[PDB]
Write a protein that binds this ligand. Structure first.
Ligand SMILES: NC(=O)c1ccc[n+]([C@@H]2O[C@H](COP(=O)([O-])OP(=O)(O)OC[C@H]3O[C@@H](n4cnc5c(N)ncnc54)[C@H](O)[C@@H]3O)[C@@H](O)[C@H]2O)c1
Ligand SMILES: NC(=O)c1ccc[n+]([C@@H]2O[C@H](COP(=O)([O-])OP(=O)(O)OC[C@H]3O[C@@H](n4cnc5c(N)ncnc54)[C@H](O)[C@@H]3O)[C@@H](O)[C@H]2O)c1
Ligand SMILES: NC(=O)c1ccc[n+]([C@@H]2O[C@H](COP(=O)([O-])OP(=O)(O)OC[C@H]3O[C@@H](n4cnc5c(N)ncnc54)[C@H](O)[C@@H]3O)[C@@H](O)[C@H]2O)c1
Ligand SMILES: NC(=O)c1ccc[n+]([C@@H]2O[C@H](COP(=O)([O-])OP(=O)(O)OC[C@H]3O[C@@H](n4cnc5c(N)ncnc54)[C@H](O)[C@@H]3O)[C@@H](O)[C@H]2O)c1
Ligand SMILES: CC(=O)CSCCS(=O)(=O)O
Ligand SMILES: CC(=O)CSCCS(=O)(=O)O
Ligand SMILES: CC(=O)CSCCS(=O)(=O)O
Ligand SMILES: CC(=O)CSCCS(=O)(=O)O
Lengths: 250, 250, 250, 250
């Protein structure tokens, strides 16, 4: 058995762990990211044993042309699309902090990548999943879809849209064999957050708000994705699986 | 006495009821909408008693220049901005239905008006509220911020972002004297929904999902906004006030 | 118009503020609490001007007999019951902390007052409101209905039940003219909690978790109750109105 | 390996699927239920292949003495308690419908089994889990913890308490190595529900409110429990995993 999974933001962090997990299970993966060079370096160092089973596609998820071509390339190469994991996401730069001082260009960029990218990915894959009569979509949202992360306004805003888009696809397509759920990770150690977590004071600060008193990992994010993408979640649809050491429970 | 409120989407529906209510209580209003012509007609038929206490400003909330100029005009005319009611919103045309068949242009327009417009409105008024040491923002979200409306994916997506943007401003600015909350209306009779609700068979399908078995009004939306904007809600911050006849409680 | 409101836990804190506000508005109030002596002293010092417009009734809300007698006495004296405010509640003693060390007796007591008491109150007033074809119920829940308060397990547990009971009544009776909503206060200064906040280090610790950087008051809880009990909230049903200075928004 | 799991309400429905699942994977189970005869009949027909690895304990979860003795017997027989699955639950009889016509005895029985039962089980196992420095608790709640089930007031009320108790345990004990989460199933076919589901009229009515247009199964509930109980959910704490075919997403 070998499902076809598309994973965005696949060259590092959560996306890399997710793509490797699908590969380790025997699935075929279309790994999409911004740099063809980085994708090849990732393939040589992390996906060496899978070589052929992973199709590396350069694509900016915020671009309709790139996304449509990536889905067309996936269909040409593997012949179906069973799972779509919309993982690509950005926080916005050092200036995308509180609302009033975040540059208009940064708000737009964060919304384009984090939300429009997910809309475009789903829009490109649904016709194929519909034809198949079955398909699974896992969106990587965040606890910021439920509570606001201080000093990260654009990001928080974008994640509220990710959660509702998730529920929208579930409601409109559950009757047609599609499953759509979101993982809502709390604080996870990745290249996106490493800058903050590397500073004792900031790390202590966020840990103070995590009852579990630990920072999550990309492997734990991949665990949740694999659960939502498989046979053990056939009745889970339109749901948010929060994986945050109880951060949102207080 | 008199507060200064900026109300977007003020020439009709909820926006009109909201603007008229602030005026009736003795406040001054900067009424922003897309058409100078319609704004004048509205001012003549609904706001004649208040004359100059209402500043009619043509503005597309999705446009940074229009919003910045509207805020500057409000400051010039009234001297402060005490309340911002981000009411303007669109559903998307008849093709903005389920996700896969919604025109990309429609998804971008709905996100631009419903979310970017709210970011731009808050980005422009916050600097002024901060210097005043007090400010209140009421965002008109929707129960679609909490559950998905079937066949209205872009709209549902945008409202998820509005609710989170609301919590973001509350979390980042509560300490500086700012209040930001959202009203989440269920089905309300307005120019935006009139077409559907006019048909008994369509109204009936909507009513079946409302335990109260009644369609809401613009007057009730205005009631919730006045509550959230005034002195009886000084400890309400970062909250969603759902007004849907129990639609979301089932 | 003079409405008849039954207010539980009326001799102190939120309940005292609520009863007082109904009286000041011209309504008649049946003030219920545990001690007739305390109620009379409360009546002499806070309700003097109203005299006969407030019926003081001794009642343990957890006791079916007391509740039924209190509703019968209200009908006899005033002839109708328009509003019921289920405010009475307890936190449990210093031993009702984390789950495993809370005495079974304390868990049972907290649940009986905070939950069974609300069930009994609603059960006793609903037949009358149904006959009147109109009635409003406001339950005083807590943000503990949505997130957990560390070291207050029984209390947190009880409030989850209050929130769902609220939703249950709204769904089953909204079509019959009944409205049922819940206020969910965050940290408020009242005798029930006014001992943790009293100690500088604790209050300070509490404030660090409230973005608005302030403790709420019973006057603000009364403000929310009045909104939910009246004419400005006719389409609000099955909702939880959070009043916490953005405590739950992060 | 070989964990020790306590599963309440283990003789039928979800509890039986959960119990069997732990056994099939090589874990040892203390199966608790109301009738020793039924547990033996079950041990005979469903667990015939594990004999010794499953300890049958008659116990009314609502009874502190029964619960304490059941935990004593599990420790004595197996030596530890690694997982507790609080599955036992009742809906109330035909008279436990809307709140006002719910016999007080039924409301009390539903709260004692569905809520006090969980408090007691958790109170009984937590000292041991803490001594071990590790432990996982999975509570079976319901979508009724989030929305109200029409005509099932006591049930709905109880499930709101279960969700918050879950968050309470997670928040107070996550730092001590304990995990506590809840599964919130939608409509599942079990002996507790077949009455309704069987009747064509009712099933259709139910299916109409489920976007996925299918009823859940005990096997799917066990799938969710195993996920929350194992190594793939080490960073999931204080969470509610909704499994309802999108029922709560609309
Ligand atoms: N780290 C955390 O605390 C945490 C918590 C919750 C969710 N997440 C999510 O994890 C996801 C993946 O990132 P990560 O942090 O796990 O590792 P990461 O940040 O190192 O990698 C993120 C990936 O997204 C890619 N990407 C960015 N914009 C893109 C675009 N327009 N098109 C295609 N690819 C693009 C980047 O190149 C990168 O490979 C993000 O969506 C993030 O929101 C992280
Ligand atoms: N009617 C409901 O059931 C309901 C429920 C929840 C929220 N709302 C919100 O109410 C708000 C107002 O609509 P309504 O239904 O009350 O009345 P309406 O739909 O008749 O009017 C909406 C107003 O928004 C204005 N507008 C649209 N785009 C704009 C832009 N780019 N810049 C400035 N103004 C713009 C329109 O011109 C119009 O005046 C919307 O945000 C809508 O989402 C309505
Ligand atoms: N103080 C806060 O921050 C806050 C926040 C949210 C909700 N509440 C709720 O307010 C309610 C009342 O307490 P408070 O803190 O507002 O004021 P308070 O604690 O000063 O007064 C509580 C009242 O409840 C009465 N009472 C207790 N048990 C009773 C019973 N069995 N029958 C009848 N009356 C009884 C007490 O005598 C007292 O008059 C409780 O339900 C509490 O959960 C308080
Ligand atoms: N059926 C559904 O759609 C659904 C959905 C969500 C949650 N649940 C929960 O599943 C649980 C069990 O019911 P089911 O439908 O899974 O299977 P079921 O109804 O066939 O079996 C329920 C079990 O609970 C046991 N039980 C009842 N009271 C008990 C007590 N006081 N002490 C010990 N055991 C007791 C019964 O004897 C029986 O073995 C309940 O808590 C129910 O709320 C069911
Ligand atoms: C919402 C959340 O968990 C934080 S997302 C922003 C992480 S960072 O870039 O500020 O380190
Ligand atoms: C109901 C609402 O606020 C917008 S979502 C439904 C749009 S329409 O189909 O009623 O035109
Ligand atoms: C604080 C509150 O709203 C009631 S629950 C906590 C009670 S105490 O521990 O502050 O006495
Ligand atoms: C159906 C369910 O999840 C529990 S609430 C309804 C119980 S019954 O009416 O199907 O017996």
């Amino acid at each position: 058995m070998s499902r076809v999974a598309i994973v965005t933001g696949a060259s590092s962090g959560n996306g890399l762990a997710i793509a490797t997990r699908f590969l380790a299970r025997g699935d075929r993966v279309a790994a999409l990211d911004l740099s063809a060079e980085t994708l090849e370096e990732t393939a040589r160092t992390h996906w060496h044993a899978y070589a052929d089973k992973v199709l590396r596609v350069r694509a900016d998820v915020a671009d309709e042309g790139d996304v449509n071509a990536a889905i067309a390339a996936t269909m040409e190469q593997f012949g179906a699309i069973d799972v779509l994991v919309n993982n690509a996401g950005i926080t916005g730069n050092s200036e995308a902090g509180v609302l009033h001082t975040t540059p208009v260009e940064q708000f737009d960029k964060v919304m384009a990548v984090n939300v429009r990218g997910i809309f475009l990915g789903c829009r490109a894959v649904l016709p194929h999943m519909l034809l198949q009569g079955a398909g699974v979509i896992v969106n990587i949202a965040s606890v910021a879809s439920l509570v606001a992360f201080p000093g990260r306004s654009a990001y928080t805003t974008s994640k509220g849209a990710v959660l509702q888009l998730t529920k929208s696809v579930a409601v409109d397509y559950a009757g047609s064999g599609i499953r759509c759920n979101a993982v809502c990770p709390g604080m996870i150690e990745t290249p996106m957050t490493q800058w903050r977590l590397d500073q004792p004071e900031l790390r202590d600060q966020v840990l103070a708000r995590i009852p579990q008193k630990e920072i999550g990992t990309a492997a734990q994010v991949a665990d949740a994705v694999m659960f939502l993408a498989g046979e053990d979640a056939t009745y889970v649809n339109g749901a948010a699986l929060v994986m945050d050491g109880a951060y949102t429970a207080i």
